[PDB]
């Protein structure tokens, strides 16, 4: 669990360690993890005597180095209960000529089904009986990881098309704030398709509230670095 | 506890004559 | 140093485990070193009920018409015989609706609760309970899953006997207590067996 | 630091199908 | 230099003087898990002075009366933090 | 604070009538948990002539 | 319930009886609390032919409440949005609302 | 929360004005302790007759221009984003609507080429702004939602650095002035503004003692 | 018994994975202490939803192939032991039945030349294994005795390094994971495998905190 | 393992490119330390966007030519080795097959005169290689065993000096590039090749800094 003490905006600054080189503080992540981050606004909001923090945090993710992925993603559709079949060979347009070592990680396989990898880019997704929803599984065409998303429809009409989770993401509503102590918590998710080496930047805009109901905004950033082996 | 349904018996009447 | 009494709590915590284990075993006990319960004995003649039609589908069901048929079909010369059922079945009964909209039992009083002892229905809560957690009344994927226990009926004072030899005892075990761990020991002896299992029938879906 | 005497336990028995079955009492363990 | 320490502790006296081995840096809440208290609890340390003061309002005690594989013993009091200085 | 007896363990087993020993069973939890109490307050003033 | 193939939310007397008798009697005797509009909602129900389900012709259904363990408190939430909501053919009854409780 | 203890005007203890570092987007708070100046002047403490003035000593005039639109309640509003970035040289326009500085009581979706649609929230009338980002350069687009009756007036196009209308205060028991200092999201890093403060104490009979000071606000990115 | 304290992912603290030595034939146990990573995430502790995977980074494919047979209960089973070792050169074959890895419910009368007979123990229905060794090359031979009605399934030919089906346990009160790590008698000294462990935590509300680590198993002779 | 420290590009402290000696058959490792150039550019260090290029400055084209063959699974393959050595002078052809550079998933038995039979590894599909020595001159022969269904593609006849493609790595914490340098067994002693590396660092905001260097690989024998 990461921890960060936000700078107090006092005209003085840079206490503690801050082995400086950049602006935003650093965060190391490993592809596949889902970790928890804490931020302690005690230094900045406690002097501003009022009703403390509010649950109006706003996050944004933008990448400073992407190295676009090699294999594309894909979408699959099938009704409830009915076995699904699909191909995994046209998802790796390779510039050069080389074989296609399809593989399915037992760690990132489906959650409500089972998949039998064929001999050549074919696979059988037999969804769970008495189950309808969206289900994924993360293939690896010769090292380059991508996700294949399948939605099993409850036989009535259809299901919508989900948005293909990004490399780095902060979940929708899994954050909190304790106005009694001015400490913010949220979750930092890293897709299994993130490439080791890239760096994404997370900006956090936190807003306090005075004794009467006005605002004190606070902006800070963080540099998430997708590194392999923790 | 998750919200459980409360399925009650419908209009059950007959056992020997199907409707046309 | 406790601000309580573990012992008298544990002494109560063992008898509660005996009472519930005995009664359950006497129902579903499996052969060796447990009295053979009348459920698994499976020599009570079992009556299974018809399925119904709905939109062509052949869902299994359980109508009030069945319950009256089952209770009345007891041979008269065997004697008077009570019935046993999980209260979720009795809740399923009282909440039935006829064709238009009326209740079958207790027409227009918000609740149907007749004196059970006069209708000879002793009620319990650790019988197989066909309406799974009161969530399987049944019109679509809520069919009763045919092959489930619903109720039983028997002249109990002759269809099953429960023997008793010694009530529970508690004896310190000097030896095994290694000056850290005071170790108590408890036990009791009892048993049961099925008598003439002609008096007694079982309803199923 | 104001420990009460409240002892909320909230666990259930069944009813008992024991007063139904015929009762017999034996001293020896083989009848 | 930055190094975490999973370290079992004890509770000396009523006020529970907590003698941590190293000095747990700064605003980072040092957690105490196990030791009967069902959920873990974060207490801020005092800069430089490792010594802490365990509260007297433990939200759980999760006892296990009536066990013979361990004779109830007593779970395990532990504590983790990060002592080192960076830079 | 108060007690919260969680679940009585399964103690007895119906063992065979030859062994000279019982067999251990699962224990029960008690979960000594607590809870606080809140307070309620407010004020109101008056003049003195304007109240006479 | 499928009102001409539309599936509006609903709450009918069969549900109220099945909900109150399901309480496992080994917990003790339990009382039910609810908003007085709900109890009015139950009292005005109608069977398919037009008669009333409670008090089959009295202009009024006023039963002994303390002999039914209902304990009206117009201070809880009511699914009738005060009134003028709930119990429709269409365009009413907020899915997900509160109706009543029951406990020892 | 900055804290300045002002000079005591006793003939005793680089640039003139004290410094204040600010970041585009923040809204911070400031304290000023006039104790050393007004405590010897035994009177009735301070009075809420303070005045502020903001002047620019370095601006680097903005690249993109702002814009004002108008619409009634419930009616969807449409607008473009291409006539607002005067480019002396030829370059592509990477339109971007910052998720942080989006609208407050509505929702906007960015088009692919200088297009956007502001559909206000149902049953909402007032003024709503949102800050766009044309090729790194930042501006604002202010829209007012009218209650369909007549019309609404013109909002004043919030400045790069402002002191809010009425959020000042003063405690005559300890001679402390408190006010808020907020920076627009469009302030350009590297610039410097100057804030002047005229504080007036009071003697026992209602006369006045004036006191003037200045502060140098330097808009810097990353704190 | 091995023990690894996992890194808590705080941005704080030759190869990547930790080191595990293994001996051909042993079946050992491993403990992992997730305390440093799970304690700060105050929730409901760990959940028994761990997932393992074994990969080979150095294999040295087996010289001798494995095989499988069948027989009815009580009936003696005989078969060959020579068509399983295709030898590249021409040399002699010294077949041997490792006594430490003989059958478990029968006896084998290994003939002189790649021939053997397996008499199953009286009244025994199940699967039985025994590990031959041709010219030092080790491979297993599986025999399934059927209970004279129809048949049993065909077991999966245990891998060089495996983790058993369900012998894992996770203590939520002290955040410690345990499992078993068994090494076949057919493992080849010097080979290296890799075990990745995906352990899942849980919050108070029912969401997930995943955590991934790896281990490098080195098959060494003499421990 | 070669360890080169790159020039710091500060305008301050024989040929241009450093020297890398190699031996035909070796697959060595090379480490380059960009710390002297990318550290003052305080940012996020290196990024995996390197690019290699190999150019010959002295080749002495090979006397023997290479060959490509094809066969299905399990089916024995036959081939000749006499049209591969166009001899300018008229002499004898002392065919040979080095046991160091034999095949990987099969076996070869040289005939008396440029004949060989590669019996592929039973139950194996893919590609295999081996290197012959026709009168001291070395060349390669490629065999691709097809999984009996359709066909397999054509491999690219590995070059004298090659730089493996997926074995490049960089540690942004210590500014070190790791890559592999493998030399074919066909490289003739005395030749010289040139490797040009274009390594790109990155500032704190994601922009690019490019760096170019070269290394002169001198294929020698006897180390």
Short mmCIF file of N, CA and C in Angstrom, two decimals, chain H residues 140-195:
data_model
loop_
_atom_site.label_atom_id
_atom_site.label_comp_id
_atom_site.label_asym_id
_atom_site.label_seq_id
_atom_site.Cartn_x
_atom_site.Cartn_y
_atom_site.Cartn_z
N UNK H 140 -11.42 29.38 -21.85
CA UNK H 140 -12.69 29.00 -21.24
C UNK H 140 -13.83 29.35 -22.18
N UNK H 141 -14.92 28.59 -22.05
CA UNK H 141 -16.12 28.77 -22.86
C UNK H 141 -17.29 28.83 -21.90
N UNK H 142 -17.89 30.01 -21.75
CA UNK H 142 -18.91 30.25 -20.74
C UNK H 142 -20.28 30.27 -21.41
N UNK H 143 -21.19 29.47 -20.87
CA UNK H 143 -22.55 29.37 -21.37
C UNK H 143 -23.50 29.63 -20.21
N UNK H 144 -24.61 30.31 -20.49
CA UNK H 144 -25.63 30.59 -19.49
C UNK H 144 -26.93 29.93 -19.92
N UNK H 145 -27.58 29.25 -18.98
CA UNK H 145 -28.86 28.60 -19.24
C UNK H 145 -29.97 29.44 -18.62
N UNK H 146 -30.85 29.99 -19.48
CA UNK H 146 -31.91 30.94 -19.18
C UNK H 146 -33.20 30.20 -18.85
N UNK H 147 -34.01 30.70 -17.92
CA UNK H 147 -35.25 29.98 -17.59
C UNK H 147 -36.35 30.31 -18.58
N UNK H 148 -35.98 30.36 -19.87
CA UNK H 148 -36.86 30.44 -21.04
C UNK H 148 -37.72 31.70 -21.02
N UNK H 149 -37.60 32.52 -19.98
CA UNK H 149 -38.54 33.64 -19.80
C UNK H 149 -38.14 34.85 -20.63
N UNK H 150 -37.05 35.53 -20.26
CA UNK H 150 -36.58 36.67 -21.04
C UNK H 150 -35.15 36.50 -21.55
N UNK H 151 -34.15 36.56 -20.65
CA UNK H 151 -32.73 36.68 -20.99
C UNK H 151 -31.90 36.65 -19.71
N UNK H 152 -30.59 36.39 -19.83
CA UNK H 152 -29.70 36.54 -18.68
C UNK H 152 -28.57 37.53 -18.99
N UNK H 153 -28.00 38.17 -17.97
CA UNK H 153 -26.90 39.12 -18.20
C UNK H 153 -25.58 38.44 -18.55
N UNK H 154 -24.51 39.23 -18.61
CA UNK H 154 -23.20 38.79 -19.08
C UNK H 154 -22.26 38.54 -17.91
N UNK H 155 -21.67 37.35 -17.79
CA UNK H 155 -20.69 37.10 -16.71
C UNK H 155 -19.34 37.70 -17.05
N UNK H 156 -18.49 37.94 -16.05
CA UNK H 156 -17.33 38.82 -16.25
C UNK H 156 -16.03 38.16 -16.71
N UNK H 157 -16.06 36.90 -17.17
CA UNK H 157 -14.88 36.26 -17.77
C UNK H 157 -13.70 36.24 -16.79
N UNK H 158 -13.86 35.39 -15.76
CA UNK H 158 -12.93 35.31 -14.63
C UNK H 158 -11.48 35.48 -15.04
N UNK H 159 -10.75 36.24 -14.24
CA UNK H 159 -9.38 36.66 -14.54
C UNK H 159 -8.39 35.56 -14.20
N UNK H 160 -7.15 35.67 -14.68
CA UNK H 160 -6.14 34.66 -14.33
C UNK H 160 -5.94 34.47 -12.83
N UNK H 161 -5.80 35.55 -12.08
CA UNK H 161 -5.69 35.48 -10.63
C UNK H 161 -6.74 36.39 -10.03
N UNK H 162 -7.50 35.88 -9.07
CA UNK H 162 -8.57 36.65 -8.46
C UNK H 162 -8.59 36.41 -6.96
N UNK H 163 -9.21 37.35 -6.26
CA UNK H 163 -9.54 37.20 -4.85
C UNK H 163 -11.06 37.17 -4.76
N UNK H 164 -11.67 36.10 -4.25
CA UNK H 164 -13.13 35.96 -4.31
C UNK H 164 -13.88 37.13 -3.72
N UNK H 165 -15.15 37.26 -4.10
CA UNK H 165 -15.94 38.45 -3.80
C UNK H 165 -16.01 38.74 -2.30
N UNK H 166 -16.64 37.85 -1.54
CA UNK H 166 -16.80 38.07 -0.10
C UNK H 166 -16.48 36.77 0.62
N UNK H 167 -15.19 36.55 0.88
CA UNK H 167 -14.77 35.46 1.74
C UNK H 167 -13.70 35.92 2.72
N UNK H 168 -13.45 37.22 2.79
CA UNK H 168 -12.54 37.79 3.76
C UNK H 168 -13.16 37.76 5.15
N UNK H 169 -12.31 37.95 6.16
CA UNK H 169 -12.76 38.04 7.54
C UNK H 169 -11.64 38.65 8.36
N UNK H 170 -11.94 38.90 9.63
CA UNK H 170 -10.95 39.48 10.54
C UNK H 170 -11.41 39.22 11.96
N UNK H 171 -10.46 38.90 12.83
CA UNK H 171 -10.75 38.68 14.24
C UNK H 171 -10.07 39.75 15.08
N UNK H 172 -10.81 40.75 15.57
CA UNK H 172 -10.17 41.83 16.34
C UNK H 172 -9.59 41.38 17.66
N UNK H 173 -9.82 40.13 18.08
CA UNK H 173 -9.22 39.66 19.32
C UNK H 173 -7.74 39.32 19.14
N UNK H 174 -7.33 38.91 17.94
CA UNK H 174 -5.94 38.56 17.70
C UNK H 174 -5.34 39.27 16.49
N UNK H 175 -6.06 40.23 15.90
CA UNK H 175 -5.54 41.06 14.82
C UNK H 175 -5.02 40.21 13.66
N UNK H 176 -5.93 39.44 13.06
CA UNK H 176 -5.58 38.53 11.97
C UNK H 176 -6.55 38.75 10.82
N UNK H 177 -6.01 38.90 9.62
CA UNK H 177 -6.79 39.02 8.40
C UNK H 177 -6.73 37.71 7.63
N UNK H 178 -7.89 37.20 7.22
CA UNK H 178 -7.97 35.98 6.44
C UNK H 178 -8.70 36.26 5.14
N UNK H 179 -8.13 35.81 4.03
CA UNK H 179 -8.78 35.94 2.73
C UNK H 179 -8.36 34.77 1.86
N UNK H 180 -9.05 34.61 0.74
CA UNK H 180 -8.86 33.49 -0.17
C UNK H 180 -8.17 34.00 -1.42
N UNK H 181 -7.29 33.17 -1.98
CA UNK H 181 -6.55 33.51 -3.19
C UNK H 181 -6.70 32.36 -4.18
N UNK H 182 -7.42 32.60 -5.26
CA UNK H 182 -7.71 31.56 -6.24
C UNK H 182 -7.12 31.88 -7.59
N UNK H 183 -6.60 30.86 -8.26
CA UNK H 183 -5.92 31.00 -9.54
C UNK H 183 -6.75 30.31 -10.61
N UNK H 184 -6.96 31.00 -11.72
CA UNK H 184 -7.68 30.42 -12.84
C UNK H 184 -6.88 29.26 -13.43
N UNK H 185 -7.56 28.30 -14.07
CA UNK H 185 -6.84 27.23 -14.76
C UNK H 185 -6.13 27.70 -16.02
N UNK H 186 -6.34 28.94 -16.45
CA UNK H 186 -5.74 29.45 -17.67
C UNK H 186 -4.51 30.31 -17.42
N UNK H 187 -4.16 30.56 -16.16
CA UNK H 187 -2.95 31.30 -15.87
C UNK H 187 -1.75 30.59 -16.47
N UNK H 188 -0.84 31.37 -17.04
CA UNK H 188 0.30 30.81 -17.76
C UNK H 188 1.49 30.71 -16.82
N UNK H 189 2.14 29.55 -16.73
CA UNK H 189 3.28 29.41 -15.81
C UNK H 189 4.43 30.32 -16.20
N UNK H 190 5.09 30.88 -15.19
CA UNK H 190 6.20 31.78 -15.38
C UNK H 190 5.86 33.24 -15.18
N UNK H 191 4.58 33.59 -15.23
CA UNK H 191 4.17 34.98 -15.09
C UNK H 191 4.21 35.40 -13.62
N UNK H 192 4.03 36.70 -13.40
CA UNK H 192 4.06 37.27 -12.06
C UNK H 192 2.98 38.34 -11.96
N UNK H 193 2.16 38.26 -10.92
CA UNK H 193 1.17 39.28 -10.61
C UNK H 193 1.49 39.90 -9.26
N UNK H 194 0.89 41.06 -9.00
CA UNK H 194 1.13 41.81 -7.78
C UNK H 194 -0.19 42.10 -7.10
N UNK H 195 -0.28 41.76 -5.82
CA UNK H 195 -1.49 41.94 -5.02
C UNK H 195 -1.23 42.97 -3.94
#
